[PDB]
Design a protein around this motif. Structure first.
Motif, short mmCIF file in Angstrom:
data_model
loop_
_atom_site.label_atom_id
_atom_site.label_comp_id
_atom_site.label_asym_id
_atom_site.label_seq_id
_atom_site.Cartn_x
_atom_site.Cartn_y
_atom_site.Cartn_z
N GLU A 185 0.58 -1.12 0.23
CA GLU A 185 0.26 0.50 -0.05
C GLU A 185 0.38 1.18 -0.06
N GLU A 186 2.00 1.36 0.75
CA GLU A 186 2.38 2.54 0.82
C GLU A 186 3.55 2.69 -0.48
N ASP A 211 2.38 2.00 -3.32
CA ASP A 211 1.21 2.23 -4.20
C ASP A 211 0.60 3.82 -3.77
N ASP A 212 0.58 3.92 -2.91
CA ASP A 212 0.66 5.53 -2.22
C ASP A 212 1.78 6.53 -3.10
N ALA A 213 2.94 5.87 -2.92
CA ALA A 213 4.25 7.11 -3.54
C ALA A 213 3.88 6.58 -5.13
N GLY A 214 3.66 5.47 -5.43
CA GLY A 214 3.51 6.02 -6.46
C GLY A 214 3.47 3.71 -7.25
#
Lengths: 138, 163, 132, 38, 51
Positions: B157-158, B160-163
């Motif tokens: 998830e991290e 994915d949030d970052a990019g």
């Protein structure tokens, strides 16, 4: 094979002791073929290398050696190789006067019917022997 | 020591022994072999014994002087006795000696006293055989029976949030 | 092969005396013997019958030259030892003891014999050397 | 007859072979007996 | 060749003989001068002695 055996064969073998029976048989070869009569002369060199390296023995060595000395020795092209080994053997410090005396007298007898090349070899060879063992001035 | 206490068993410095102890009752190396046997040179002979070629073994003992053969048999027994793992190779030497010089060995006043070590040595190997076969059979059946018998999919998830 | 296996299967069910002959058929091979015992011997009774028949024959003549029956016995036990000892028939145990007695003697036979096999070897080899 | 408890008989056979001696034994027969024992 | 007697060994007397083949061996006079022990060296032995 025997000519190069002592130098180009023994040092490169892993267990050169295996060659002795070949060499002793070579050193003891007696044949009706005259060309094979030189075999003990050549085989002697390789045999001595084995005896020196591992303290190995040939029975009645000098008595066999006294037999090998013959007029044919004075004429073979391998005469020079033989005498070189003779210098080492007859430099021994446990040789009796009689034993040396026999080699002296027989060689002098052979020089009568010998090439000058052989005679040139014997005359200094004998001076070394007589000098080594002073009792033989008789 | 308490007198009620029983004295314990101690072997101490005693000498163990066995009932079989009958001491008080080209390419050949023959000349070396005859040489070492006469002179009892362990180092020289051990090199001769190092040959594993059967044809050499036959040829060497073929030419060996028959009297020297007997002492060779005695000595092989001793070298076997000290080191049993060398049993296999040294029976071959004892074998070829026996067949070639068998005629000589017949014409000997006594053999058991002079070959007692071999007989005792050879007997020990035989006593093993019945047990090993039992071991082999048990060892036979078992093998006989047993011979027959994330990051790629990761979703972070991290990141994915970052990019 | 398949035919003999079926015939042996039928005779086992039928309690025929010809079971020995089926086991004595030379068509049998060692891989087939494994397949038959593993696949076809699914009932304790059939295992008992074969063991009784084979053991009786070997007990009568332990020194028979034909290695087939000994092959059957050796493979029968290795693959079905758990089922064999599970058998509680007294006669089966009695047949076992008889087979042990005959085979036990044979083990006593061997150690003297192996010496004699050696003792002849040099006589042959010594004779060969003399010829040469 | 042997070619044609038995251990005692075989032991007896081993006794014969020595009494015969290596000389008296004849090659043709010995091959057969070598086969039988094997 | 050298000889010693009346020494504390189980053997009363010992006879040591050089061979010149690298071997010096012990002989016991009481048992007809029989071979009882020996040692090996690198080369020929010319001299041997014991205390």
């Amino acid at each position: 094979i025997l000519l190069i055996l002592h130098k180009r064969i023994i040092p490169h073998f892993h267990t050169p002791t295996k060659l002795m029976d070949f060499l002793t048989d070579s050193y003891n070869l007696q044949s009706s073929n005259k060309n094979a009569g030189v075999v003990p002369i050549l085989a002697l060199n390789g045999l001595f290398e084995l005896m020196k390296r591992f303290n190995l023995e040939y029975p009645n060595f000098y008595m066999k050696l006294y037999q090998i000395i013959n007029p044919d020795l004075m004429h073979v092209k391998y005469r020079a190789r033989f005498f070189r080994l003779m210098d080492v053997f007859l430099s021994s410090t446990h040789l009796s006067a009689h034993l040396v005396a026999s080699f002296i007298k027989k060689l002098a007898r052979l020089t009568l019917e010998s090439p000058p090349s052989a005679i040139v070899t014997v005359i200094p060879f004998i001076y070394n022997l007589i000098r080594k063992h002073p009792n033989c001035m008789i | 020591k308490d007198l009620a206490s029983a004295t314990n068993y101690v072997e101490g410095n005693a000498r163990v022994t066995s009932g079989d102890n009958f001491k008080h009752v080209t390419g050949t190396v023959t000349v070396i072999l005859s040489q070492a046997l006469q002179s009892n040179d362990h180092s020289l002979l051990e090199t001769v014994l190092n040959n594993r070629d059967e044809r050499v073994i036959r040829d060497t003992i073929f030419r060996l002087k028959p009297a020297l053969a007997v002492i060779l048999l005695e000595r092989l027994a001793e070298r076997i006795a000290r080191q049993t793992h060398r049993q296999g190779p040294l029976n071959v030497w004892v074998k070829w000696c026996l067949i070639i010089h068998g005629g000589y060995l017949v014409s000997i006043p006594n053999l058991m006293s002079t070959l007692s070590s071999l007989h005792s040595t050879l007997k020990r190997r035989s006593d093993l055989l019945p047990r090993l076969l039992a071991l082999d059979a048990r060892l036979d059946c078992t093998i006989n029976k047993f011979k027959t018998l994330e990051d790629d999919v990761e979703y972070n998830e991290e990141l994915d949030d970052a990019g | 092969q398949v035919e003999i296996a079926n015939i042996l299967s039928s005779h086992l069910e039928a309690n025929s005396t010809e079971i020995l002959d089926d086991l004595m058929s030379g068509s049998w091979t060692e891989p087939e013997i494994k397949k038959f015992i593993l696949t076809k011997i699914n009932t304790v009774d059939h295992l008992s019958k074969i063991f009784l028949t084979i053991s009786k024959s070997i007990t009568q003549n332990p020194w028979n030259e034909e290695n087939l029956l000994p092959l059957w016995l050796k493979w029968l036990l290795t693959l079905k030892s758990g089922e064999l000892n599970s058998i509680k028939d007294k006669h089966t145990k009695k047949n076992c003891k008889h087979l042990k007695s005959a085979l036990r003697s044979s083990e006593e036979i061997l150690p003297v014999l192996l010496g004699i096999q050696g003792r002849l070897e040099m006589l042959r080899r010594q004779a060969k050397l003399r010829e040469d | 007859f042997i070619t044609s408890q038995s251990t005692q008989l075989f032991q007896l056979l081993s006794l014969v072979l020595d009494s015969i001696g290596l000389f008296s034994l004849e090659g043709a027969l010995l091959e057969n007996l070598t086969l039988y024992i094997d | 060749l050298d000889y010693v007697e009346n020494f504390d060994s189980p053997m009363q007397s010992a006879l040591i003989a050089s061979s010149l083949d690298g071997h010096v061996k012990v002989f016991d006079p009481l048992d007809n001068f029989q071979v009882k022990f020996g040692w090996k060296f690198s080369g020929p032995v010319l001299s041997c002695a014991v205390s």
